[PDB]
Amino acid sequence: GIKLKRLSDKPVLMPKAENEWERAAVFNTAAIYDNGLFHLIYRATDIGPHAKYGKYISRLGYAVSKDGINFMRLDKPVMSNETEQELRGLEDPRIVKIDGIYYMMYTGFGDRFQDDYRICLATSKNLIDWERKGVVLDEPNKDASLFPEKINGKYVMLHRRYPDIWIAFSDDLKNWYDHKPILKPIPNTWESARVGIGGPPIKTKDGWFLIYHAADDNNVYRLGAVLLDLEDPSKVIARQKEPILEPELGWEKEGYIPNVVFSCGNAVKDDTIYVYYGGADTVIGVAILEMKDIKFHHHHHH
Amino acid sequence: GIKLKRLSDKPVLMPKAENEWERAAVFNTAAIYDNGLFHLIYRATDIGPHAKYGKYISRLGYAVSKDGINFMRLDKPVMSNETEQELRGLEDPRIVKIDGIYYMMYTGFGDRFQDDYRICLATSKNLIDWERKGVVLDEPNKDASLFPEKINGKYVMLHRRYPDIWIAFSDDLKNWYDHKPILKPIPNTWESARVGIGGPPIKTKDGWFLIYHAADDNNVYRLGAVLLDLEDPSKVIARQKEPILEPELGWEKEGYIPNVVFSCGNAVKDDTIYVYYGGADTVIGVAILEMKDIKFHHHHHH
Amino acid sequence: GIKLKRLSDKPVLMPKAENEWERAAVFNTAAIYDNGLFHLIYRATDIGPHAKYGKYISRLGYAVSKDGINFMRLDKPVMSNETEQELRGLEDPRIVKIDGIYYMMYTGFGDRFQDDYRICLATSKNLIDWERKGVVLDEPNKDASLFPEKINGKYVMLHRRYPDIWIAFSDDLKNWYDHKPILKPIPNTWESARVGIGGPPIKTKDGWFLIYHAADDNNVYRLGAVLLDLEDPSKVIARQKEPILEPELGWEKEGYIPNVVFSCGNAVKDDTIYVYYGGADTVIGVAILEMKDIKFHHHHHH
Amino acid sequence: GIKLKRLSDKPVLMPKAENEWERAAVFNTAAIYDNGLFHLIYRATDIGPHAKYGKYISRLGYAVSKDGINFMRLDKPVMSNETEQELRGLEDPRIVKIDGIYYMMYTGFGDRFQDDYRICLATSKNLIDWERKGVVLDEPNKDASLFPEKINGKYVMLHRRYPDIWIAFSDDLKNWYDHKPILKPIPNTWESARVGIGGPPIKTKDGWFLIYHAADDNNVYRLGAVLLDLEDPSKVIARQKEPILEPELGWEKEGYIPNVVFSCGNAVKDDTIYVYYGGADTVIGVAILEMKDIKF
Ligand SMILES: OC[C@H]1O[C@H](O)[C@@H](O)[C@@H](O)[C@@H]1O
Ligand SMILES: OC[C@H]1O[C@H](O)[C@@H](O)[C@@H](O)[C@@H]1O
Ligand SMILES: OC[C@H]1O[C@H](O)[C@@H](O)[C@@H](O)[C@@H]1O
Ligand SMILES: OC[C@H]1O[C@H](O)[C@@H](O)[C@@H](O)[C@@H]1O
């Protein structure tokens, strides 16, 4: 089946003690290949990302690489906690580029009352200067992204009304309609508790290739793969039974949150997918998948 | 009760990003007052000391102060990871001075196989140039120090066969005998999981004043105090029920490990004890106790 | 007439202790406005750039700003000392963008024998990944740049055969011809010892606007302005008598070399020129000139 | 003749860009061997030490070494500019240890009026905590040190009423008497313009070994050596004609002040003298002399 291949046993990005905003953890990064470079917009916290460590604030960093392994990083966050909806910061960004514009969906965590987090949108032409567009869906939700192109003249988003992956459609990026669930947890498996997107889906000749995450009943996080129909991505063509990535290395199994691999970004250079993922909500790693290796079992049964 | 009094709300020593060896954390320092100055031999790490990626290394720095609050620091470690037993460095030093010689016990962490850490001894005449004397006890152990004077013509050491404070005796500083436990955890209290020495004990008219640490069942670290008989320090005269120091300030409650105060050093100037402690395995603070405020309840009953 | 206006009394970029490559000095930066951002490719040294001990090495950093005053910076150099011609590093880069490609001329300092420095060229599409094209002129020379457009179908460069600004022409960026001097020092003035370009010239309706530097007989460095004919930039239309910028602030007057302002970069946003300059070969500042304020004295007489 | 031997072509101590107080120059250091270590109390400036660079302030740093070559350094100065006599800082310290106490003479530079500099004294038990004792001689003077032992029950100092090395005597370190010149410049030589002590003198079986400095008529600084009588150090028993050290390395010939070697410290371990010197008032080097090679 499909399995992501780690390039080494070492993270590609680690917290940096010198800078308070990224002193504890860097994880769950957006990623895109553009103009001959890999770019990360990474989630960073000052404190370990759980209440037992403290009142962490998530901010978004920028890193850049020629090879997708060795990164340079900017000294200050490119987005910081600047609104009420973002009092506790910005989480788990997903980025696509459409017609010259980068569209980032992230979760603004306000923590002012129960379930005070929202999918928010920001745009950029350059990945450094971000313009907030505000809340996308006025409801507790997260794990959101646009598709990287319009389909049938509409913007399409993925979201996560608990505990399923949902899709929705928009003409104007402000009003969303035709909400429906497209992927659900499966009882008594590695993907029983909840599912959500990983990074944004990638267009393939055979359909939309979507990496997803799931948690089991022991709260272990793994990645999986699903293929969606090109014209109607609400239709699942295939869903791989087995995970494509699971916690194996020491820094995936242990850290601020044990036994987590979690992706918000998949960059493509020359038909190789570079899947960036958080390990234990502490560091960032990379694992690859060649596009020619995207193969699902063909079957037909109700 | 005995309570340590913080000398300020700010650390007295913090990590320094420009020096790799102390970039992440400085904590758990030895301390001694000598020749009109306070001297720290501090534990320092290059990456967070709970990191599950890479291989953090502990090295020993030197700092010096006229007032016990405001420190100057040397730019390079006075002991670095130079033997196999110290591949991952030197931890949690405790120092005493006997007859012109400084005796430092530290934990050498090799990590070459299961439980590869050992109490090790180094000596110096000047606190800068250290001569390794090798492993003290050939067994997994830590939290060790000499007493600062011979007792009945013998050297006495404290150690920590799990989970109790132990003592032992030596005529030649090489062979240790009459090992016995002297202090144990108390169930259902702040000191239930484990106990260990803080810094080396301090001689008083009423007995040996020994600061100890303990962890509770949620791994919160606090300091306590016990008074041992002068001639036979295996005999506990009094043990304070309540802690003398617990995590309260932000940098004691939050850092690389939450809710830790941890001491390896207590310097004495003019009948005031300066207790140096790590906060959250991240920074170093100081709190005082005047000798006249060392008050315990004595008893006479089986 | 023309005077640059400082945007701040503080540097916009300073050396950073934590990073050895830029520990001592950041100065003499290239600059360009692109894709809604100001970008600096800055000269940095590990030790003072006038040190007579050791061997200072110049490497090239990257910084980026939305407003041209407040910069973010990458943690590693985008070009380091990687050839024999660059044993002592890369100096005083000038950048232009032509048809999607950035062309950087810098001085490679080898110091292997007498006068071992050369104008070298590197190209990039993104300002991060630089491809060396090698030595431009096989002779001791410096203070070089392309013009930001071809003229009459040719590439044009400025250089500095001592002590004058020179121009030369090329069809292929490898072979240069029609070398001629275009600007000379003026005896008994602030610009008596030597002249050289500042940043690359900027096209205006009235001609090429070229900031230049000069040294006086006491080695004080100031900036001036000259206007060159559009079609034949060897012809000077006007040269301002007085400097446009001179050392005034404390960090321009004092540092590793006293009384120096020195520019290698002039970014343009919305008809305002942002002139980045080194102060005292130690830090980087910014001063502006609106295009409408480019006014020279003209006359008509033999 | 006596020649100091450099141990390498590299400084032992250089300015540190991270710390403003020592960003430009470290030079002209005191030195002593004590308790198994070499200790430097070094002059440091924030700006090159000439008015053409700016209003430099001299402060005193601490460094320490096991081998006399490879130093560790403290992050802040052990003495900073804290009196009016020291507005522009503390210069060119010389240290001796007598009966458990370190005695440092330095120049306090106030620059408040013409010739506003004074020999000042500070003491310490540990080289870190310094107690000022104030101005030693109320006159423009510098290049001062105690001898490292009392002689005939008196403290003895060297000083520099311009342009000669002087000696003086004291019972109490406050009142100085029996001032006399002991060493003068020699016209038309490398030592024509002025002379001054280097580090404090060192006792030998043959007399007090004193390194001195001199400037020539082009302001080039070199070191020389003299031998003084043990009981009466006002009597010069030998003075070497040729210098023992002169600017040769690039960082001795060029820097903030060209063509300078200048010593304020000479540490002794196992019969070898380690002579620490400023090069070009910018960096610190070391050159050695074995005791058995002190031959006039
Ligand atoms: O901790 C595991 C996982 O839980 C969250 O809720 C996710 O959205 C991620 O932010 C994180 O990696
Ligand atoms: O992390 C808390 C505490 O646990 C360790 O095991 C101790 O020995 C100290 O090194 C440390 O401060
Ligand atoms: O030092 C002043 C000035 O002199 C050099 O030669 C120039 O090329 C610049 O590198 C520098 O700013
Ligand atoms: O500059 C050479 C020399 O001149 C000064 O006056 C001396 O006292 C030293 O401070 C210095 O090294």
Curated annotation (Swiss-Prot), chain D:
Keyword match Nucleotidyltransferase: no
Protein's UniProt keywords contain Transferase: yes
Molecular-function GO term, any one: glycosyltransferase activity
Known EC number: 2.4.1.340
The entry's keywords: Carbohydrate metabolism, Glycosyltransferase, Transferase
Pathway assigned in UniProt: Nucleotide-sugar biosynthesis; GDP-alpha-D-mannose biosynthesis
Enzyme class: transferase
pH profile: Optimum pH is 6.0 for phosphorolytic activity. Optimum pH is 5.0 for the synthetic reaction.
One Pfam family named in its UniProt record: Glyco_hydro_130
Name of the protein described by the UniProt record: 1,2-beta-oligomannan phosphorylase
Organism encoding this protein: Thermoanaerobacter sp. (strain X514)
